Design a protein around this ligand. Structure first.
Ligand SMILES: Cc1ccc(C(=O)Nc2ccc(Oc3cc4cnn(C)c4cc3-c3cn[nH]c3)c(F)c2)c(=O)n1-c1ccc(F)cc1
Ligand SMILES: [Cl-]
Ligand SMILES: [Cl-]
Ligand SMILES: [Cl-]
Length: 273
């Protein structure tokens, strides 16, 4: 029970409820519906937002405190490839809410899949795909430098802005993104995120394939213990494959840092005409 600590932590990002106008439902999240909205800002402008709400039921003091912890966890993230907290509404209503920026094109996984259909985005070029990987690496570099562990890094948790920038986030199958040492023990480090980053790169390069076709979830641990890894996609440059492969080295200490991955990815992207 840390409700007093949490309210003091979130004080300077509290927002007046009446500045916010809610709109339609975007979907369901951990604690309830996610609405789109408009938020009138301090300087006088307007901003299209996503508003995370809590279910109408009497959700416990623990759920409320868990909800606000997540916001407090995000509060100081300031980076263009990391989702940012716009603020919170508490003290005017029975369930509080968290205000986030609107991500026009939604989650990256669904976007990759829609790009293979005529009606959605068009065919994504190789350079744009690489740029998505770069953005994610930039975001993860920032987070791992702050000692934040993601733990569920995947294309489905990455979000696309109006200008096609990727933001790392968590919405709140998954065995297939988990590093070998994290399956084997409870161990998570930044190097476990590196592994999940490699899988996300492979998702991006395959334009949204589920990792490890023909391997079922309950077979995964054994498959990885035998040293087997994701195969090279048919259209994937050898250099790009070498980069994703380095993310799955059995010893976490041998995997590259996010800085190194990001440098390697920028170099490959800039190497293309
Ligand atoms: C640490 C932390 C705490 C809390 C969060 C969080 O609350 N994120 C979060 C994310 C998405 C959410 O949903 C949507 C938001 C938008 C915006 N635009 N559009 C169109 C949307 C549609 C939906 C939607 C929901 N259902 N269906 C669709 C949502 F409600 C909450 C978070 O991400 N992190 C974090 C974790 C790891 C990092 F690297 C960085 C930050
Ligand atoms: Cl953002
Ligand atoms: Cl597919
Ligand atoms: Cl595979």
């Amino acid at each position: 029970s840390h409700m007093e600590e949490l309210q003091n932590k979130l004080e300077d990002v509290v927002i007046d409820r009446n500045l916010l106008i809610l709109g339609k439902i975007l979907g369901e999240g951990e604690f309830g519906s996610v609405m789109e909205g408009n938020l009138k800002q301090e300087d006088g402008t307007s901003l299209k937002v996503a508003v995370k709400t809590m279910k109408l039921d009497n959700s416990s003091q623990r759920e409320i405190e868990e909800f606000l912890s997540e916001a407090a966890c995000m509060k100081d993230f300031s980076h263009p490839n990391v989702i940012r907290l716009l603020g919170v509404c508490i003290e005017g209503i029975p369930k509080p809410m968290v205000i986030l920026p609107f991500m026009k094109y939604g989650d990256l996984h669904t976007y990759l899949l829609y790009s293979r259909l005529e009606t959605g985005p068009k065919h994504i070029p190789l350079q744009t795909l690489l740029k998505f990987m770069v953005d994610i690496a930039l975001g993860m570099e920032y987070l791992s430098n702050r000692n934040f562990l993601h733990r569920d890094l995947a294309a489905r948790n990455c979000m696309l802005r109006d200008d096609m920038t990727v933001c790392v986030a968590d919405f709140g199958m998954p065995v297939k993104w988990i590093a070998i040492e994290s399956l084997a023990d409870r161990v998570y480090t930044s190097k476990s995120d590196v592994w999940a980053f490699g899988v996300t790169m492979w998702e991006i390069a395959t334009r949204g394939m589920t990792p490890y076709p023909g391997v079922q979830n309950h077979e995964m641990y054994d498959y990885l213990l035998h040293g087997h890894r994701l195969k090279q996609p048919e259209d994937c440059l050898d250099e790009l494959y070498e980069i994703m492969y380095s993310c799955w080295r059995t010893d976490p200490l041998d995997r590259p840092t996010f800085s190194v991955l990001r440098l390697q990815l920028e170099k490959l992207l800039e190497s293309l005409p």
